[PDB]
Design a protein around this ligand. Structure first.
Ligand code: CYC
Lengths: 172, 162, 162, 172, 162, 172, 172, 162, 162, 172, 162, 172
């Protein structure tokens, strides 16, 4: 996998180039913004069980078909699998947030997932709805102004939304 | 690519776990050290040409035969001189990359993996490159923790060639 | 035991490698964060009795049946009250240990491994302990990064019970 | 394995105790001294190839029997094994220095090593002489006053000598 | 799905062997026991509604807080009451299925696998379900070997929740 | 795999339903008929070596091309493979008879078999002829009126023919 | 492993002998008594979780040292291991009851267990006390006169006590 | 040794599980079938000598060369006649053991494992033994389910030799 | 197919190595021995019909029952006589192939693999074929090293059937 | 794999035939020519490192794009892989020369290689140019008239060219 | 140790088989080639000192810096000259051993395994040894197949260093 | 393993010495005698099945206890194991004959065999009697003067007896 710094290096290396002042500046800015990124990861991780549970409870309230006998989340084995997938997706999104790059999410989680669900008969559209609900909950938790030194994390929130949106698109 | 951030993620992912504070502390350490590391990277980059030029000459002074001996593995032709300058510049670019990435990963992937094979197959002496690196370390002009950063990656390359 | 230092060593040792700057940065991050973590650990320790006492009562208020219902798994006897106070004190001691060690390792080894089995076998409700932990988080009196440290380990326990 | 902090916790846990103010103070002092420890590890690691090579060259100059035909370091396979062992020992000593505890050295390196050498017919006494030479070289490098902010690392050097002495005793 | 017949086949198939008399005896034992097992299954099915209704009330009587406490995991709303009645009916349907199939396979596949995870994630107490099951056992009205059959599968569920 | 009882349960579960009186009656009838099913399995299994050998000898007498040099059953390794396949097919048919359901036959034996033979160049049509001959022999043995309490096993014989026919269709 | 029938055969075979009328009679008597044995196994298995839990709760009430910090059942990992061992022992005793022979218990459970506990520092004497408590509970459950056709299971209870006593002696 | 009871235990033990009703049904099937199986075992035992004697002669009649041909593998000497009678008695004793144990385990362990190797090495024809077994089946004098039991184990041996 | 040349290659290839002199010596040994081996192969081929005919009769003389006994596995019909002559010719063709290839590979692949299974399933006696082979060895008419070659492969077949 | 002798046998066996005098003669001629074949293999193998190195140096002088940053032989890991492939190809060609048959080359080396390179983005055309250069060097070394008993190895050289040409076509 | 005889045995032993003619041919090839190989081995041995002395000087002439440059890895002191002569003699002794054993095994075990590691660690140039070996090949004085044998093992060493 | 040539080299190498003229002469003599050694190996291998069978039949005629019910060669599994061991021992002896050295026999066959038999309860003395009988049969076959160019193989026969004697001593 790549983080944000590794990604710039990799691009440089393929050109055979040293970095430019602009590229150094960009990386230095990433470092300058690092405490915010650490806070987002900590907050989301610290709330992971509720983010998942609450999104699952909401999905099944809105999409009762999934928990009727014959539905894809019926039986405890299928419900446990569904809950696990929600935890997995959220785990890999948080890795992407720490890294400042989507590569770990794409490579270790999203690649092949659409095909996995199609072979199983799991409805990827409904997965996308569970991801969106975790996204909204995660962002509200990461961006809560209470109990933190005040500042603007809007760019980071947009980046975090991106990662969730990418997961949703990969399964939908 | 091995960086403090990818090592942190990899640890959490091997264990099937969310990141914990154990990993977040590690990344914070990276972020704080990046101050010194970026200072080193910029300095080495800005002075790259003179360091490369001086390093090549350090090699030729230590090993005079490399300027006269017949064979395509030696710097006794314009092409061999150009290959050598190229290679020294590769080592220095990799050091800058390690400094930017906060770890050895760029050097490991782009230079160290297969190094021993290349040196053997093409009859290149590791001692040539060790000399170049020792010149860079002696003459980069850095001080304080920026120097400590640069030297850690230069010495890592030297160890890889020893 | 999982600490930033043992994770760093383990990484280097899996790879058969000397420590590199990648790992040393990680330990430095630990050492700098230890300032906040030790402040939290000392505070929680100094106020342990009141936090334990208050937390137990928070549980009994949230779950009144635990004070009246017949059975050895409930706090409806002096022995059950003592078991419960003991267990809350165990959770808080573990949080202090994680703060001292800079990671989850003490909690993981001494408390989380086998947790689910114990709760099932002895008919202990995870929700009891989640309530205790939420009281500690609300009432430890810490601020700034010491609070962030404490809460990270308290929330880790809560997640383990969810 | 344990580091210095984990060791105090483990002891505490076996007693069922919270730490004392004295124990907190001791750990805080360890943290306060951490830059020195990082410098020692960096210096020794950065010089690892020369520390090994120079100690090996000196051993074989003093103990020529080891490199005569029939000797335990004769043939390139046995010489490579001997050099590797010296690197291993130094690697595990440096882990112990970072950890501030000998457990990783004892558990992952020194346990069973005497028996390994006896089964092979490798002379553990000569190993101990190679360890001592690396010890003296490592300490001189870690404790070099040039090129570092001045201060007293004497206690750390005594601790580092300890680890090397422990390795030597385990094989001798 | 684990039944005496699929276990017999699986044994023969693991060994790459035709069925032998060893397996055919096992299936005969199943066929003879099916008399008692089908009697139990039909009885439980015919009386399912009253058993489910009575069992839910047994739970609410044992655990009164489940009727009043605020939260979606409790039976303090019409939706929670409906979820609980649903779940008890699931346990009883599974018992009937085990009786029909002559083994634990239906319960194992449709209910026990993932049980612990679900109870934890959704904050459902195993003791709730144990109480429901104990009511069914006490009140199913069966005697003789039909009772022994029913109780074996009810106790299997209870053990799974303990 | 599923047996006949498991199959009814599985269907029930997907609907969320308890069984009906008709379904209970059907299963009770299966149990009532069980001694016949056990006799069929015992008889066929007890004769398995002759059923296979005799069908193989007859196939190769009718289809000499298979045992001419260059033919797919020429060489002892290919003949042993062919004999083994006949034993396999008969083994899985007998499992299906005990289970009262074709699932074990389909899943563990017939799925992919056509493709296996095509990749090898084995003539699946000739396999189908060997299966038919085992079918006819098996039925004659299972349905022999001598040495058994008299009764009507015609429905069971029709079911047993079915399983053999299914195997034949899967390879032809 | 051996059951009671296999044990008689094995003995016969080592002598090269057919069974005697007395040996046939003994085995026939075992079969005659089989419903009692099945009831004992069913009863004990059906109560396994309470037999274990209740014996564990009683051990730790009597032997509080085991659950004090530093004690061998302190920490959830060690408590889970202890509970697991009690379940294991009871599981293997019930196998022995079904088989009518101790071989499965001896071979798959008790052999080496004393040495395992000694290496760990687990107090085998305290294990023996947990086994005795399960023995007494198991016997009371198996031999409960309520809810079963009346008869004398005293010989079987003596046999069942034997198996528990054998487990206790193997660890004490 | 493969018996219905050891197969039941082995299944439960592979899965780390207590015995369930699935296994207990299997053992009950064994216990009920033991009535027929013990009747067969006693009959074959009581008539063992005549069956062995008659079976050997059936072999010699089918295969006359075995009484005249020179070589230690044939029954053309008193020693060869004694080896053959011994071996037939071994097959019949094993059948009795399978009947007593309720499965193939005794035959599998004491006779079938290595059978092919022995027959090859010592130049013994499987067809000799198949003939002996076919005589026993034809002449044991059993009826009903006792016959079905005996014949299942005799045919199992025949299949092992084919 | 096992020949000295394919064994040499396989060794080098397992080790990821170029052929060395160790392997080239082995192939030279093959090439020199091929003189004797080809002489044997041509002789056996030229005299194949008489050897096959004589060998079949040797079998019938040793084992007279094979000419009279009823069953499709015996040579008591024109078809059985033809199967037997065919099979003897197969053994002799394989010997010629081993001689040409310089090793056992053709016999191993085309005849020995599955041999035991075929003989068992079709009730063919190994001793029949051993007799045929012993006749070929006695009557091939070869001398010197050509005989040694032929006999090595004939005895290899005999050992495979023993 | 097959050698030249095995190939004739295999063909014979599929027809059920003994060899003919012409086929015996052909094989005898192969044996007669064997010293030349051994010399070719020895010569080429003895020069393998220079054949590879010299062809690689020439390729990269002619095709500098391959060693520019971003090129497929840039970085030491990719250069080592490229050198390794050249060694592999030459190794398998020499096996084919010893065997007098291309089967080992086709089966163990060339099959799937085109697809491997396409998935990687390695330019198979440039591989073909490296193979051709090794071919020309190998032939010059094998066919050098100095230091060997004089004779005509032209047919063998044509066969050796064939194998190299086959490798080149498989990757191009 | 890799010799044609140990490779033959190893093949047979991997396969659990007796030696066959396939292996015996290989050993015969070894025995016939031993004539040339022993002639080479004796010649190289008899002329060892002059070859070693001449080879060392060839290295010093090709690489003059090795006689003057400061460092213990160079032949610029009496000790370094002695180490170098020693090492060349080691290479030549190994060639003699390979000739005696009929394969590369002695060189592989005593010299090639770990070679790359030693050359790197002690800063010895492979090109030094390649030059020595090329001198031996040029000047051993052998002809015919004895030369072919010697050169095969000398070129094997050269390839190992390239 | 070592052959006779490797053994001389190994000894030389431990001394750091080139071979002497006497050592060269000894090896040349071994090569000169090689056809005899090849004949012995061929003869014994070609007769391996009869050597084993005949020795087994003779052992059991002399030692009937081994094949009485309860005896160590009673049951077909134990008889097959015994026959296999005799084949193994003879196989490894023939390897030793080809190699001209006992190392392969010692290392891959005889080491630990005494302990194996003791753990099993197999009577190593009776094994030694089976080895002696194979020895005498093998020697008679290898040394048969019929059908071979006449010469003196007495030294080789003494060497072959040695290997068998060594096997016998290792198990007795
Ligand atoms: C160890 C395994 C095992 C076997 C093998 C078994 C067989 C078995 N078959 C039986 C009967 C029978 N078997 C058959 C079967 C047939 N009748 C015919 O005329 C047909 C052609 C045929 C076709 C399959 C019938 C009709 C009965 C009596 C009715 C019944 O009991 O279903 C009976 C009852 C007693 C008897 O009448 O002999 C048993 C015990 N039970 C077992 O536990």
């Amino acid at each position: 996998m790549l983080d944000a710094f590794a990604k710039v290096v990799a691009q440089a290396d393929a050109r055979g180039e040293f970095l430019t002042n602009a590229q150094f500046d960009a990386l230095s800015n990433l470092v300058k913004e690092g405490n915010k990124r650490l806070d987002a990861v900590n907050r989301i991780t610290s709330n992971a069980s509720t983010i998942v549970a609450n999104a699952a409870r909401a999905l099944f309230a809105e999409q009762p078909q999934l928990i009727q006998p014959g539905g894809n989340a019926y039986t405890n084995r299928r419900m446990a699998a569904c809950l696990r997938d929600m935890e997995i997706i959220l785990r890999y999104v948080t890795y992407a947030i720490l890294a400042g790059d989507s590569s770990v999410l794409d490579d270790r989680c999203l690649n092949g997932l659409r095909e996995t669900y199609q072979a199983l008969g799991t409805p990827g559209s409904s997965v996308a709805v569970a991801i969106q609900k975790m996204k909204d909950a995660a962002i509200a938790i990461a961006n809560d102004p209470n109990g933190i030194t005040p500042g603007d994390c809007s760019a980071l929130m947009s980046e975090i939304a991106g990662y969730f949106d990418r997961a949703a698109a990969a399964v939908a | 690519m091995k960086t403090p951030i990818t090592e942190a993620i990899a640890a959490a992912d091997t264990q099937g776990r969310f990141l914990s504070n154990t990993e977040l502390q590690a990344v914070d350490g990276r972020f704080k050290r990046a101050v010194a590391s970026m200072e080193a990277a910029r300095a080495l980059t800005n002075n790259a040409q003179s360091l490369i030029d001086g390093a090549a000459q350090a090699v030729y002074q230590k090993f005079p035969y490399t300027t006269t001996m017949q064979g395509s593995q030696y710097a006794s032709t314009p092409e061999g001189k150009a290959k050598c300058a190229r290679d020294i510049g590769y080592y220095l670019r990799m050091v800058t990359y390690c400094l930017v990435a906060g770890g050895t990963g760029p050097m490991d992937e782009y230079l160290i993996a297969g190094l021993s094979e290349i040196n053997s197959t093409f009859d290149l002496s590791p001692s040539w490159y060790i000399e170049a690196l020792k010149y860079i370390k002696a003459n980069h002009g850095l001080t304080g923790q920026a120097a400590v950063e640069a030297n850690a990656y230069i010495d890592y390359a030297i160890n890889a060639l020893s």
